[PDB]
Design a protein around this nucleic acid. Structure first.
Ligand SMILES: [K+]
Ligand SMILES: [K+]
Ligand SMILES: [K+]
Ligand SMILES: [Mg+2]
Ligand SMILES: [Mg+2]
Ligand SMILES: [Mg+2]
Ligand SMILES: [Mg+2]
Ligand SMILES: [Mg+2]
Ligand SMILES: [Mg+2]
Ligand SMILES: [Mg+2]
Ligand SMILES: [Mg+2]
Ligand SMILES: [Mg+2]
Lengths: 55, 48, 77, 272
RNA sequence: ACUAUAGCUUUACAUUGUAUUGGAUACUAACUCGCGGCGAGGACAGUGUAUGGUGGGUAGUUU
RNA sequence: CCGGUGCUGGUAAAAGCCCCAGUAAACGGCG
RNA sequence: GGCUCCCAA
RNA sequence: AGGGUUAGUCGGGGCCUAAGGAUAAGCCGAAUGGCGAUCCGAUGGAAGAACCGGUUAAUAUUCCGGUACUGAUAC
RNA sequence: ACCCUUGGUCAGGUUGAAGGUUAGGUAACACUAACUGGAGGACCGAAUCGGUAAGCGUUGAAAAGCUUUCGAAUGAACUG
């Protein structure tokens, strides 16, 4: 899986960054508990736009 | 001696009656075949 | 209706083939299971009867896209 | 106690039945009984899945409180009664709240006694306590397997178990079968052993009593034909080969407990 | 007897994740069970595919 | 009588098998 | 009808 | 060919449930479908309630003469 | 054939288990005798269920019977 972080997570951090994870760690923990979301193209574009605007 | 046919109207209708035939897909198959052959007596319900 | 709700996969029919080429009818079953998913876009929980292939598609394109695709293709019901 | 029949008839020569010396009432409690239907070993498709079952005396089911969730409410023992559904006797209880219930009658429980359930109950015979509250070395029965699910373990007439030691969240219990195993300390057990321990001394005497109890004759496999049983066939008597069932399952020492069952982590020593 | 096969059983991949110290231990969030959220387990178990054993229980045959 | 036969223990991408031990109110034998 | 006895209740 | 079976009170049904059957919510499953707690289902439980006498070719506790009783309904 | 639910049937006679009461007896139970009691896949035997032996029948009255004889007959009974 590829996920865009929505919070800070120990051992894989950088809140609001794109990181690849195992499918289970991210389908069964991260997304349901609210840390990170799936890294679809729309989400990637939205995050890129926000980072570009805040740069 | 006791023979094989021991009549009972309730059992006859429960086993071979029109509603018993209509309750099952294979019973409706039997009814369709009998209608196609053109039987005047469709089921034991027709008899008296 | 034992069938994957995301891909529409159902059981296949084939043969067991022995070394002497004896052929016996058999069914290839789907790696099917029931799983619960958190729908983020609707903020709720859903239960889907899916295959491992359906789970791969969900983990590839997200749950919302997979559900909308399956509904468009008719697999969802 | 038991009563040995005098040999006035051949069907009574070897008959020993119970004395019924503990029973104090003959009529069951009407609100706690219901008529029970029989199976001839037939399942819901009508096919006989279990053999040698059929007929027998008509019976009514008695509601037994195997859970005992009325914590802290004292109850009075009213009667000791016969139950056709189990080998032990049962006891009628009147709670101070006004409820009624049936419990398995332990050895030594008399009409007029008081019983209680829950942690604050005294560890006296008939009381139901979580195993965390029972002193080590006590004779117990009616042991829960999961907390709140009701007693499952030690229920037959005369049977008892022992709390040998405790190890935190689990206690160690020795079973009637001789197995030693770990039980969650939040599960409940009743103090004392099940009564009617003379139930094992009874002899039917004749085939009619088995028929009354609802058993049907059992046929040996060696007196069948090969088409019916793997052990059948032959001219004259024959031994039938290695003992096995109709489906060829060996009947001498082959183990059938699932080898990967999870509960084997709680079983210290095994004995069947 | 020859050849298959239901069932049973073994291992690998999937379901299936995290940390410590690899080879084990631990965790909880997948999954399983119990009581009416709480409790008990837990990446095992069960299930799918593949695979080696076993298999007159069943079948087709030969002699 | 445990020698025989059963039963119980300690390849694809480990079982087994071996070996040892046990079991006859297991099948079986008592030249 | 009730009563007594019994257990297979 | 003609005639002959007459009920508020007899029997049944209308009411209730047993075995079993059909189903709801759900579960399972190439299809046809298989299961699954309310309904159906007497061989059981309630029925709201009489007898006497006479009479036909063929009916009678049903017709008639007495004697009664029961259920609803308008004061 | 087996099972499930709900009903029904079994003339008459005999024997005499447990238990009980009354006397004796014991430190006390036990234990003896009489009366009572009425158990039992108990006995004899109709209905009933079954089918032992012989005779008869064998294009039979009957595609399995009849007569005599015989088993069980409160039960693992028979039957709607
Ligand atoms: K036998
Ligand atoms: K065989
Ligand atoms: K008759
Ligand atoms: Mg024979
Ligand atoms: Mg011989
Ligand atoms: Mg063969
Ligand atoms: Mg051929
Ligand atoms: Mg109804
Ligand atoms: Mg007339
Ligand atoms: Mg007799
Ligand atoms: Mg006679
Ligand atoms: Mg007799």
């Amino acid at each position: 899986m590829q996920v865009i972080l929505k919070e800070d997570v120990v051992n894989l951090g950088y809140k609001d960054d794109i990181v690849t994870v195992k499918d289970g760690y991210g389908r069964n923990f991260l997304i349901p508990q609210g840390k990170a979301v799936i890294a679809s193209e729309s989400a990637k574009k939205v995050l890129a736009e926000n980072l570009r605007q805040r740069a | 001696m006791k023979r094989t046919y021991q009549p009972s109207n309730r059992k006859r209708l429960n086993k071979h009656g029109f509603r018993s035939r209509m309750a099952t897909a294979n019973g409706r198959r039997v009814l369709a075949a009998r209608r196609a052959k053109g039987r005047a007596k469709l089921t034991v319900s027709d008899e008296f | 209706s034992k069938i994957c709700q995301i891909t529409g996969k159902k059981a296949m029919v084939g043969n067991n083939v022995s070394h002497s080429k004896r052929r016996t009818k058999r069914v290839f079953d789907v790696n099917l299971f029931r799983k619960k998913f958190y729908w983020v876009e609707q903020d709720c929980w859903v239960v889907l009867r899916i295959s491992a292939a359906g789970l791969r598609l969900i983990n590839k394109i997200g749950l919302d896209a997979a559900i909308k695709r399956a509904a468009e293709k008719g697999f969802l019901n | 106690g038991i009563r040995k029949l005098k040999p006035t008839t051949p069907g009574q020569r070897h008959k020993v039945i119970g004395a019924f010396d503990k029973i104090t009432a003959s009529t069951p409690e009407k609100s706690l009984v219901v008529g029970k239907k029989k199976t001839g070993g037939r399942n819901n498709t009508g096919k006989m899945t279990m053999r040698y079952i059929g007929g027998g005396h008509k019976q009514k089911y008695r509601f037994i409180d195997f859970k005992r969730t009325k914590d802290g409410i004292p109850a009075t023992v009213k009667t000791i009664e016969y139950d056709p559904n189990r080998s032990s006797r049962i006891a009628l209880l009147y709670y101070a709240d006004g409820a009624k219930a049936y419990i398995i009658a332990p050895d030594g429980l008399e009409v007029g006694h008081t019983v209680m359930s829950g942690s604050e109950a005294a560890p006296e015979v008939g009381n139901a306590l979580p195993l965390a509250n029972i002193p080590v070395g006590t004779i117990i029965h009616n042991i829960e397997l999961r907390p709140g699910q009701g007693a499952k373990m030690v229920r037959s007439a005369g049977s008892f178990a022992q709390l040998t030691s405790r190890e935190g969240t689990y206690v160690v219990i020795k079973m009637p079968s001789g197995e030693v195993r770990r039980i969650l300390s939040t599960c409940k057990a009743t103090i004392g052993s099940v009564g009617n321990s003379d139930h094992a001394l009874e002899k039917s005497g004749k085939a009619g009593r088995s028929r009354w109890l609802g058993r049907r004759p059992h046929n040996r496999g060696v007196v069948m034909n090969p088409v019916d049983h793997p052990m059948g066939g032959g001219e004259g008597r024959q031994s039938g080969g290695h003992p096995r069932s109709r489906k060829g399952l060996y009947a001498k020492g082959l183990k059938t407990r699932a080898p990967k069952k999870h509960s084997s982590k709680y079983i210290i020593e095994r004995r069947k």
